[PDB]
Amino acid sequence: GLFGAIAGFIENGWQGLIDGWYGFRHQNAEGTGTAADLKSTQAAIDQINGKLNRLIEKTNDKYHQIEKEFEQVEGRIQDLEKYVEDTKIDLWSYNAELLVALENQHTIDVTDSEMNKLFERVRRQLRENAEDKGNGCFEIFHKCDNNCIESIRNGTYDHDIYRDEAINNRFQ
Amino acid sequence: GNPVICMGHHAVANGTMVKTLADDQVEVVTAQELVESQNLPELCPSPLRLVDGQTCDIINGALGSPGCDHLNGAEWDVFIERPNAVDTCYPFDVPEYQSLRSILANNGKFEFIAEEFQWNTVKQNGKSGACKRANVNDFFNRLNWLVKSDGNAYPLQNLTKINNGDYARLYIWGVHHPSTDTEQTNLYKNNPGGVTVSTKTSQTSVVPNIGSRPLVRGLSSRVSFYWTIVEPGDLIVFNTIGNLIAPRGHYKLNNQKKSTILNTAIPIGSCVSKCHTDKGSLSTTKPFQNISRIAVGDCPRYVKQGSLKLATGMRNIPE
Numbered sequence: 001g002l003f004g005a006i007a008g009f010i011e012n013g014w015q016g017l018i019d020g021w022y023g024f025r026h027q028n029a030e031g032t033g034t035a036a037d038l039k040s041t042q043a044a045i046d047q048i049n050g051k052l053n054r055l056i057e058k059t060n061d062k063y064h065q066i067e068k069e070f071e072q073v074e075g076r077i078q079d080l081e082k083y084v085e086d087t088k089i090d091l092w093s094y095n096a097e098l099l100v101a102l103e104n105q106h107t108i109d110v111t112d113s114e115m116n117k118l119f120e121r122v123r124r125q126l127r128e129n130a131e132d133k134g135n136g137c138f139e140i141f142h143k144c145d146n147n148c149i150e151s152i153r154n155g156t157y158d159h160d161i162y163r164d165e166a167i168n169n170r171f172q
Numbered sequence: 173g174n175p176v177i178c179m180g181h182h183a184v185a186n187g188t189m190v191k192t193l194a195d196d197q198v199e200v201v202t203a204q205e206l207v208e209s210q211n212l213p214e215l216c217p218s219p220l221r222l223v224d225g226q227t228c229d230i231i232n233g234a235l236g237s238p239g240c241d242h243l244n245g246a247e248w249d250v251f252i253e254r255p256n257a258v259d260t261c262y263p264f265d266v267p268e269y270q271s272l273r274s275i276l277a278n279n280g281k282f283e284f285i286a287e288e289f290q291w292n293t294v295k296q297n298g299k300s301g302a303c304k305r306a307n308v309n310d311f312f313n314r315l316n317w318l319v320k321s322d323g324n325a326y327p328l329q330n331l332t333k334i335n336n337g338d339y340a341r342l343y344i345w346g347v348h349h350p351s352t353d354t355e356q357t358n359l360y361k362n363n364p365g366g367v368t369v370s371t372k373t374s375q376t377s378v379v380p381n382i383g384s385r386p387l388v389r390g391l392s393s394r395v396s397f398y399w400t401i402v403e404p405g406d407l408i409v410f411n412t413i414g415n416l417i418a419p420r421g422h423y424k425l426n427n428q429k430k431s432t433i434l435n436t437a438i439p440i441g442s443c444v445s446k447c448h449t450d451k452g453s454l455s456t457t458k459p460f461q462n463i464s465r466i467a468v469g470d471c472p473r474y475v476k477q478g479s480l481k482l483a484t485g486m487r488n489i490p491e
C-alpha cells in the first residue's frame with residue numbers, strides 16, 4: 001500500500017489475533033499479551049462495508065428490450081440489433097473490470113492507512129518515553145506493568161508519570 | 173528500560189486472490205464475488221406474474237388457436253413462451269411477425285372485447301380440418317371465415333366500427349391465399365379478390381396470391397395476418413370484394429405497456445425472485461452475472477467475466 005506498513009515495516013500479520021483487524025502485542029517484566037484495537041478495526045470495517053453497500057443495489061430493472069438470439073441471419077436490421085447488444089456488453093464488462101480494480105486498490109490503501117494511523121497514535125502517546133524499533137514496535141524505556149500497558153491501549157497513558165525514568169534510561 | 177509494545181494486524185492461513193490496477197494476483201484476507209454464475213433450474217412465479225404459454229406461442233394465443241383457451245383473460249409481467257410450441261390450426265404467416273409479437277408481449281394482457289359485424293349476404297364461421305379444435309373442424313376463435321352465399325353472391329362489403337372508448341384497440345385480421353383459380357372461385361365470387369382496411373390516418377390493401385405452395389398442413393393455401401390499431405377518436409373500415417379473414421372484435425391495449433416475453437423451456441417452480449434468464453431465475457444480491465445476456469426483471473448486469481472478486485479485507489501476510 002501507499003503507507004508501507006502492511007507488507008512493509010510490519011513484516012507480517014498475526015494469525016492469533018482473531019477478534020480484531022489491528023491490535024497490540026507487548027512484553028514486560030511479567031509477561032506477554034495480544035489485544036485487539038477496536039477503533040482502528042472499526043474504522044477499516046466501516047469503510048469497506050460502505051463500499052459494499054454502495055455497490056450491492058444498483059438498479060437494473062428492465063422488461064421489454066430487444067431480441068438477442070437469432071435462428072438465421074436477416075442482414076441489416078439484425079446486424080444493428082446484434083451490434084447494439086455486443087457494444088453494451090463490452091462497455092459494462094469494462095465498467096465491472098475497472099470498478100473492482102479501483103475499489104481493491106483503494107481497499108488495500110485504506111487498510112494499510114488504518115494500520116499506520118494506529119502506529120502513529122501510539123507513537124504520539126508515548127512522547128519521549130519510547131523509541132521506534134523499526135518493525136512496528138516501540139522500546140519503552142521504563143518499567144511498564146499490565147495496568148501501564150493497558151493505559152497505553154485504552155489511551156489514558158500519561159507520559160509525565162514516567163518521563164524522568166525514561167529520559168534517564170534513553171540518554172544515560 | 174526494555175518493555176516493548178508492538179502494533180500489528182490480523183492474518184489467516186489462506187486468503188483470496190484479487191485484482192488491482194497494478195497487480196492481478198494479490199492475496200487479501202477476505203473477498204466477495206460480484207459475478208453471479210449460478211442459476212436456479214426453474215422460473216419463479218413470484219413476485220412477477222408469469223404466464224406459461226405452454227403449447228401456444230404468443231401469436232397463436234392471440235389468434236385463438238386450439239389449445240390456447242387458457243390464455244384468454246390472462247395478464248402477465250412476463251409471457252413465458254415455449255421453444256416447442258406447436259401450430260394447431262390453419263397455416264399462416266405474419267408479414268411483420270416480430271413486430272406483432274413485440275406488441276402483444278409488451279402490451280401484457282389478452283383482454284378480448286367481442287363486437288359483431290353485420291356482414292351482408294355472405295356466410296360466416298368457415299372452418300377447416302387443419303384447425304380441428306377438439307373432435308371437429310374449427311377455426312381461429314378470434315377470426316371469422318367468410319365464404320360464398322348460397323347463391324354465389326359476395327357483395328362489396330363496407331362496415332365500420334367507431335372507437336368512442338377511452339383506450340386504443342387492436343384489431344387482428346387476415347387475408348386468404350388459395351392455390352388455384354378454381355379453389356379461388358370455388359369458395360369466392362371473383363378473381364382477383366382483395367381486402368382494404370382503412371383508418372382515417374391509414375390504408376392497408378392486399379390482393380391474394382394464387383399458386384403451388386408446399387404441403388404439410390395437409391393443405392395448399394395460407395392466411396396472411398395483419399393488425400390495425402384504432403386510437404380513441406379514430407375509425408376502422410373493412411372493404412372486401414373477397415378473401416377477408418375478418419375479426420370477431422378487438423384486443424384492449426394498455427396505455428402504459430410494461431410487460432415482455434421470455435422464450436425458454438425452463439419449468440416454472442415455487443421459488444421467489446424478480447430476475448429471470450432463459451436458463452432460469454437468479455436469486456442473488458450480486459451486481460453482475462455471466463449466465464445469459466437474455467435477462468428480464470430486477471437483475472444483475474450481464475458481463476463477459478466469470479469471476480470478479482472484490483477485496484473485503486487487508487492484504488494477507490501470514491506467519
Ligand SMILES: CC(=O)N[C@H]1[C@H]([C@H](O)[C@H](O)CO)O[C@@](O)(C(=O)O)C[C@@H]1O
Pocket residue numbers: 298299300301302309317319350355359391393
Ligand atoms: C369450405 C370452407 O370454407 N372450408 C373447407 C376447406 C376450404 O375449402 C379450404 O381450406 C380452402 O382452401 O377445405 C376443407 O377440406 C378443410 O380444409 O378442412 C373442408 C372445409 O370445410
Ligand SMILES: *[C@@H]1O[C@H](CO)[C@@H](O)[C@H](O)[C@H]1NC(C)=O
Pocket residue numbers: 330331332409
Ligand atoms: C360505405 O361507404 C360509403 C362511401 O364510401 C360511406 O359513406 C359509408 O359510411 C360506408 N358505410 C359503412 C357502413 O362503412
Ligand SMILES: *[C@@H]1O[C@H](CO)[C@@H](O)[C@H](O)[C@H]1NC(C)=O
Pocket residue numbers: 209462463464477478479
Ligand atoms: C460463468 O463463469 C463460471 C465461472 O465462475 C463458468 O464456469 C461458466 O462457464 C461461465 N458461464 C458462461 C456462460 O460463460
